[PDB]
Amino acid sequence: GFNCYFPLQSYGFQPTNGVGYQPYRVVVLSFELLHAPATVCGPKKSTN
């Protein structure tokens, strides 16, 4: 009824939209360093 709407609204991904309205795939890299020993670190070079 009135004053009762779903909090989720759909995105309009039309191909005719502008550059700023284009669908961009965004990946977030979150880094957290605690006192625990590290398991993933920098890579190793393979020079000639």
Epitope: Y5, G12, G18, Y21
Partner: antibody, heavy 116, light 109 residues
Framework: EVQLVESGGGLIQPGGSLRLSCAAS????????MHWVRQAPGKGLEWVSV???????FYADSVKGRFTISRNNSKNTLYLQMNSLRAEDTAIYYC??????????WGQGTLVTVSS | DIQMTQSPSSVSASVGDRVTITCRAS??????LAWYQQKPGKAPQLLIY???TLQSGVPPRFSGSGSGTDFTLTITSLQPEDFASYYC??????????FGGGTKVEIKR
Amino acid sequence: EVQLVESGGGLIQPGGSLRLSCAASGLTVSSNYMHWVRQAPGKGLEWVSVLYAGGSAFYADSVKGRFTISRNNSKNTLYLQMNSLRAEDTAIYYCARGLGDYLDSWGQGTLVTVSS
Amino acid sequence: DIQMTQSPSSVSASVGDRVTITCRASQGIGSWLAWYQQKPGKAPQLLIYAASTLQSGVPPRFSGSGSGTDFTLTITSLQPEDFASYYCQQANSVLALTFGGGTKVEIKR
């Protein structure tokens, strides 16, 4: 079943501070998106500022500064404060509540005249 | 960033005519346009929203169909009561509204 009233309009100097008062009868002041649309006399409407349900607000490019929005949950009223005014600020504005990307509710308007 | 231009400004039509007001935007927007009707001396009111559906209280004479760039507010039956200005508004990602100029419909004389 909505009803919005406004008060505080009148004649004031450009070098002064003016506080508005927008009241909602069947609407809360912390649960909807509100827009302050101001329309010049003889011209079309123009966006000025927007406030969200939380503690966030936004302003346009021409009115980015000298603007403050502070809602009040005690008396269910909306307050807009204009610390600085210009000669082009005279117009008619309507406080309202709305959803995302569009607003449907509307309220009355108070005429303000600013001059020397 | 976005600017609003409306092709019609002052149009005259009879009772049995379509006003055919067109709305154009600088950048393509997909079905996020709403129309208004502000009478002189009266607070504005919404007519349609999202350019596809219709408000419950608004009579169903108003209609619109626009995909990305060209929008319209063709009316099947023009009534003497709804003689006011028309605006099409599009918002941004930060809820930045953008209202444009007024198109007025006057009775032929």
